DNA sequence: ACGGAGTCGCGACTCCGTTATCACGCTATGTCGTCAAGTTGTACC
DNA sequence: GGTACAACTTGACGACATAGCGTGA
């Protein structure tokens, strides 16, 4: 077993030089210092460690270090350097797996961290947490440039190898070693009876918990998805941007000819009091009072000193001791809720629902609810809502900071990172290109936004053909998970009933709801315990109707209350009552999942969510890992030059860009067989079903 | 009355070519230093009656004139020598300060 | 733990309740640090 | 009379922290 770390000149898109690599070994207990010319010896040491059956440990090695070494080995020596999967261990994945809750424990320690590392899984953050940090290379280089005198550039420190970078790499290696020993000090996720630093790779992957293997296979597959990427349609996005900009100018002209301008009291600094006594009054907006001013200036001449010649007049137009109201000529901005609320007060409408800071609720429900006497403004409310929607679409598409047109690289492929663990419940999150924010198939222009996303925009590298995209989704995931949990209460009757037709369609017929996704939203809100006002807001009716539907479904399915009572008596000790808070004692801060993780719980009425979301996330994660493993072992090839590629793993649904429709059908059948394998492996008491679609883009695949 | 309340059209037709010293107040409903300075202006309208023109203008009910003259702060009293702007001061003055400001311009 | 409300024999006595949930993004707006430049009291030859 | 000077003040500008609200599963 060795622990290594590298140092490149740039990120994955611009890496072209290997600076230094430091190796520590347990069999020698010595530091192995290298040079920029020792790149071949570094690769030979790694290949010897793989051939000896050892384990090489990096920090975030799956996303950066392994493909960086592969690209450097290719572009320098033209030698195929491809390390195996099981001989690589990440410390970031183990840290995210063991310490899955940093926000509820980082406070009380901030006395250590500088402040910017609050809830950070970086390598320097653990260097401050383990009290082993001797400076920073970036701060040292900034001090160096300020010592010489020339200006600072953020990229110059990754251009030249030096002893400071060498010692920084040594510090990174020893922080990685201390962090690895701290994570191997665990007892639940790792049995301490076997010294894991002196075992084989098969012994290490077999004598630990299943969750570590699941997490590392998921990290390897997500790194493969990152180096794959997702296509894009630049001309269609630019045509949509021009169309939305023209319609935005059209609606801005309509709203500026509908409404008018006014004055805003923004600008006051000092304090106003009662002119009779001196008591402050909160019934006035903020004003300002100057401190220097008058009428006549200082006497400079002799007759000015004698009062004969009048002095110079007050040019600055302010007098010391005259309070005024500093205002500005605000123009009506329809992207300002405050301006919309001001105009609705001036139209004669009385707001009802308020927030915690006095300003009333301004959303689509109350904009449908406003009924005034003016038909022109009553029609212009719809133009306000359409302007807000188009402003949201443009801010998502191009004018935002995290813009698609700003993040698409030169290959036309979107490269957006994905955090594997992410949230505390185990469900994965998405980085700065957020693929979850892409609208659905019924929002206005979201059909065109999904039609601009497809696998047909990448031609073949040899034949030059548009590919075929395959999308596979699961239906009733959490509901069949709930059936699996409460089968031991209701003798499997709900699990037998859920396989008879679509459960969401049957609930839609039973509740008389307009759309299937509205039925999904309602049954999820009833599952996770919504209030009566929230149920009435979803169903579009009153809280009496909400209580009627809640009592009807609760008397239809009585096992849910028994399951909630079982959990409440399971992990919760007691519960006190504050007028504004709720003191609840647990003495059990976590719930064991399907694999055996310590999934942290936040709330006693969210422990059910903590159970079910973790169950669905683990099912989907091991499902896609098994699907990838089966598609490898059946004889296909993963990648752009091969046959298929993974490009979308947002939530409970994959998109696979195959080569032909027969290959896509093989992928769908393989995903179905992998889903049945998971349902047989984890002792699933019901049947799991998938649904695969075959279209050129997301307009057909979903 | 004592202080003539004007509109935008009355301002444009009876201020710019009125041939006299015209003092126009700019006031809003929700403030408030104008409520302080308004009895002072009512006293000056009787003290200096027969030598200048004292008027008031609402910046809320007349949205034309105040964006044309570009007012950043209210109250603000503008002295009009033959209609055009000659001298002005921003704030809520007192009676003696306002009398000194009028004596410093005549 | 006091508001909402079921109830004792319509006012008050007394019993129940109390969250939809994890992610990210964003334009608006108030706070506060930083700075360019006069200025106005001011101390002394 | 004169002359430097030094904190005060006014105005502008930029980084930063919420605020509901909007997307998805
Ligand atoms: C849509 C939605 C999902 N979820 C959670 C629970 C769901 O089981 C999970 C994914 O939801 P879905 O995948 O939309 O539910 P589904 O699998 O039954 O239907 P479909 O085949 O059309 O995809 O995310 C919510 O908590 N609130 C929501 O509004
Ligand atoms: Mg689904």
Q: What is the DSSP string of A99-162?
A: ----TTTSTTT-----STTTT--SHHHHHHHTT-----HHHHHHHHHHHH-PPP-TTGGGSS--
Pick from A275, A319, A327: CB nearest B74 = A327
SS (H, E, C) A282-320: CCCCCCECCCCCCCECCCCCHHHHCCCCCCCECCCCECC
Bridge partners (DSSP) listed for residue A90: A58
Q: What residue is closest to C23 (Cα–C1')?
A: A429
- The Å distance, CA of A519 to C1' of C2, is 36
Pick from B60, B88, B105: CB nearest A317 = B88
> How far is the CA of A640 from the CAs of A12, A220, A239, A405, in angstroms?
17, 17, 28, 23
Q: Tell me, in angstroms, the distance from the centre of ligand 2 to residue A472's CA.
A: 9
Subset of residues 351-370 in chain A with CB less than 7 angstroms from any atom in strand D: 355-357, 359, 361-364
Q: Tell me, in angstroms, the distance from the centre of ligand 2 to residue A648's CA.
A: 14
Count of residues for chain B?
106
Q: Is B28 on the interface with A (CB under 8 A)?
A: yes
Ligand nearest to the CA of A425: 1
Angle at B9 between CA B8 and CA B12, to 5 degrees: 85
> How far is the CA of B23 from the CAs of A86, A481, A570, B52, B79, in angstroms?
88, 80, 80, 7, 5
CATH, domain B4-105, list 3.40.30.10, 3.40.50.2020, 3.60.15.10, 2.40.50.140: 3.40.30.10
Q: Which of B32, B81, B94 to mutate to test the interface with A (most CBs of A within 10 A)?
A: B32
**A269, A274, A277, A279: CA torsion to nearest 10:** -70
Q: Which helix (H) or strand (E) holds A326?
A: strand A325-326
**Chain pair A-B, CB pairs under 8 angstroms:** 75
Alpha-carbon gap, residue A671 to A626, rounded angstroms: 8
- The Å distance, CA of A356 to C1' of D17, is 18
Side-chain-side CA neighbours of residue A644 (13 Å): 26
Report residue B15: phi and psi, to 5°: -120, -50
Q: Which bases along strand C come within 7 Å of a protein CB atom?
A: 1-2, 18-30, 39-41
Report residue A30: phi and psi, to 5°: -130, 160
Domain span including residue A133? 2-230
Using the 8-state DSSP alphabet, how is residue B51 labeled?
T
The protein residue whose alpha carbon is closest to atom 26 in ligand 1 is: A524
Assign residue A52 the CATH number of its domain: 3.30.420.10
- A473: the nucleotide nearest its CA (via C1') is D25
DSSP A234-264: HHHHHHHHHHHHHHHHHHHHHHHHHS--EEE
Side-chain-side CA neighbours of residue A454 (13 Å): 24
Q: Which helix (H) or strand (E) holds A330?
A: strand A328-330
* Closest among A392, A369, A37, A624 to A632, alpha carbons compared: A624
- Exactly one of B31, B36, B85, B87 is catalytic; name it: B31
Q: What's the resolution in A?
A: 4.5
Contact A83, A116 (CB under 8 A): no
Alpha-carbon gap, residue B91 to A586, rounded angstroms: 62
Is B82 catalytic? The answer is no
Contacts 24+ apart (CB under 8 A), A292-301: A292/A318, A292/A320, A293/A318, A293/A319, A293/A320, A293/A321, A293/A322, A293/B91, A294/A319, A294/A320, A295/A319, A295/B97, A295/B100, A295/B101, A295/B104, A296/B104
Alpha-carbon gap, residue A614 to A619, rounded angstroms: 9
Which SS3 state, helix, strand or coil, does residue A6 take?
Answer: strand
- The Å distance, CA of A544 to C1' of C7, is 20
Report residue A169: phi and psi, to 5°: -70, -35
> How far is the CA of A31 from the CAs of A41, A90, A155, A162, A170, in angstroms?
15, 20, 28, 18, 8
Give me the residue label for tokens 């031609």: A459
Cis peptide bond upstream of B32, omega within 30: yes
Helix, strand, coil tally for chain A in percent (to 5): 45, 10, 40
* Closest among A221, A620, A655 to A644, alpha carbons compared: A655
Interface contact flag, B90 A313, Cβ < 8 Å: no
**A406: number of Cβ within 10 Å:** 11
> How far is the CA of A54 from the CAs of A86, A95, A115, A573, in angstroms?
10, 21, 38, 47
Chain A residue whose CA is closest to B32: A284
**B63 CB contacts (<8 Å, ≥6 apart)?**
A260, A261, A262
> How far is the CA of A99 from the CAs of A607, A609, A610, in angstroms?
19, 20, 16
Contact A3, A57 (CB under 8 A): yes
CA A5, A8, A10, A13 dihedral sign is negative
Contact A211, A621 (CB under 8 A): no
Contact A450, A699 (CB under 8 A): yes
For chain B, give every domain's residue range: 4-105
Strands of A588-700, DSSP E: 590-592, 598-600, 646-648, 653-658, 690-695
Chain A residue whose CA is closest to B78: A317
Contact A207, A191 (CB under 8 A): yes
Interface contact flag, B92 A323, Cβ < 8 Å: yes
Binding pocket residue ranges, ligand 1, CB within 6 Å = A 473-478, 520-521, 524, 616, 651-652
Alpha-carbon gap, residue B97 to A544, rounded angstroms: 67
Contact A466, A696 (CB under 8 A): yes
Alpha-carbon gap, residue A121 to A102, rounded angstroms: 9
Bridge partners (DSSP) listed for residue A430: A418
Contact flag, residue A444 CB and nucleic strand D, below 7 A = no
Is B34 catalytic? The answer is yes
Give CA A493 to chain center in angstroms.
Answer: 38
Q: Is A345 on the interface with B (CB under 8 A)?
A: no
Burial call A324-359: b when 16+ CB within 10 Å, e when fewer? bbbbeebebebeeeebbbebbeeeebeeeeeeeeee
Closest Cα in chain A, distance from residue B11 (Å): 20
């Amino acid at each position: 077993m060795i622990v290594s770390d590298i140092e490149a000149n740039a990120l994955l898109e611009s890496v072209t030089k290997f600076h230094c690599g430091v190796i520590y070994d347990y069999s020698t207990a010595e530091y192995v210092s290298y040079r920029p010319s020792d790149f071949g010896a570094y690769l030979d040491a790694l290949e010897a460690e793989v051939a000896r059956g050892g384990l090489i440990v990096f920090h975030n090695g799956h996303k950066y270090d392994v493909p960086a070494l592969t690209k450097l080995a290719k572009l320098q020596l033209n030698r195929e350097f491809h390390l195996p999967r099981e001989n690589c261990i990440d410390t970031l994945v183990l840290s995210r797996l063991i310490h899955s809750n940093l926000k509820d424990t980082d406070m009380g320690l901030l006395r250590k961290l500088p402040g910017k590392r609050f809830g950070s899984h970086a390598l320097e953050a653990w260097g401050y947490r383990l009290g082993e940090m001797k400076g920073e290379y970036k701060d040292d280089f900034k001090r160096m440039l300020e010592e010489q005198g020339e200006e600072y550039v953020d990229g110059m420190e990754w251009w030249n190898f030096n002893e400071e970078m060498m010692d920084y790499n040594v510090q990174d290696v020893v922080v990685t070693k201390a962090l690895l020993e701290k994570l191997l000090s665990d007892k639940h996720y790792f049995p301490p009876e076997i010294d894991f630093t002196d075992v084989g790779y098969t012994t290490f992957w077999s004598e630990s918990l299943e969750a570590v293997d699941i997490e590392h296979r998921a990290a390897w597959l997500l790194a493969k998805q990152e180096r794959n990427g997702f296509p894009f349609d630049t001309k269609a996005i630019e045509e949509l941007y021009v169309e939305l900009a023209a319609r935005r100018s059209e609606l801005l002209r309509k709203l500026t000819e509908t409404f008018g301008s006014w004055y805003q009291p923004k600008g006051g600094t000092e304090m106003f009091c009662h002119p009779r006594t001196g008591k402050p009054l909160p019934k006035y907006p903020r004003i300002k009072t100057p401190k220097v001013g008058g009428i006549f200036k200082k006497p400079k001449n002799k007759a000015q000193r004698e009062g004969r010649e009048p002095c110079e007049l007050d040019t600055r137009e302010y007098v010391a001791g005259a309070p005024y109201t500093p205002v500005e000529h605000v123009v009506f901005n329809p992207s300002s809720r405050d301006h919309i609320q001001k105009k609705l007060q001036e139209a004669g409408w009385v707001p009802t629902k308020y927030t915690d800071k006095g300003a009333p609720v301004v959303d689509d429900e109350v904009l449908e609810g406003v009924r005034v006497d003016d038909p022109e403004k009553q029609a212009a409310i719809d133009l306000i809502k359409e302007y807000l929607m188009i402003q949201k679409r443009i801010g998502q598409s191009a004018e935002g900071d995290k813009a698609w047109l700003r993040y698409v690289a030169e290959d036309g492929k979107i490269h957006g990172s994905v955090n594997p663990n992410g949230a505390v419940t185990g469900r994965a999150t998405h980085a700065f290109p957020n693929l979850a924010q892409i609208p659905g198939v019924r929002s206005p222009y979201g059909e065109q936004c999904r039609a601009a996303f497809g696998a047909e925009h990448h031609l073949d590298g040899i034949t030059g053909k548009p590919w075929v995209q395959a999308g596979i989704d699961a239906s009733g995931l959490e509901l069949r998970c709930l059936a699996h949990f409460m089968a031991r209460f209701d003798n499997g009757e709900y699990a037998h009933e859920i396989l008879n037709g679509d459960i969401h369609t049957k609930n839609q017929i039973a509740a008389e709801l307009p759309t299937r996704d509205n039925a999904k939203t309602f049954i999820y809100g009833f599952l996770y315990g919504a209030g009566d006002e929230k149920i009435g807001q979803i169903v579009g009716a009153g809280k009496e109707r909400g209580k009627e539907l809640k009592k009807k479904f609760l008397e239809n399915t009585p096992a849910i209350a028994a399951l909630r009572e079982s959990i409440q008596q399971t992990l919760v000790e007691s519960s006190q009552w504050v007028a504004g808070e709720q003191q609840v004692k647990w003495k059990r801060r976590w719930i064991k999942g399907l694999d055996g993780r310590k999934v942290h719980v936040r709330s006693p009425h969210a422990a059910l969510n903590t159970l079910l979301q973790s169950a669905g996330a683990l099912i989907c994660k091991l499902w896609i890992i098994k699907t990838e493993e089966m598609l490898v072992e059946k004889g296909l090839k993963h990648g752009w030059d091969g046959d298929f590629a993974y490009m979308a793993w947002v939530h409970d649904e994959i998109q696979v860009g195959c080569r032909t429709e027969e290959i896509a059908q093989v992928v769908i059948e393989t995903a179905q067989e992998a889903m049945r394998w998971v349902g047989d492996h984890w002792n699933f008491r019901c049947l799991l079903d998938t649904e695969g679609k075959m279209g050129p883009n997301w307009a057909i695949c979903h | 009355d004592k202080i003539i309340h004007l509109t935008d059209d009355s301002f444009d037709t009876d201020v710019l070519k009125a041939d006299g010293a015209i003092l126009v107040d700019f006031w809003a409903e929700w403030c408030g230093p104008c409520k302080m300075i308004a009895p002072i202006l009512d006293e000056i309208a009787d003290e200096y009656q027969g030598k200048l023109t004292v008027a008031k203008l609402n910046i809320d009910q007349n949205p034309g004139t105040a964006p044309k003259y570009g007012i950043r702060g209210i109250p603000t009293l503008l002295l009009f020598k033959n209609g055009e702007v000659a001298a002005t001061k921003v704030g809520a003055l007192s009676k003696g300060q306002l009398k000194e400001f009028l004596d410093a311009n005549l």
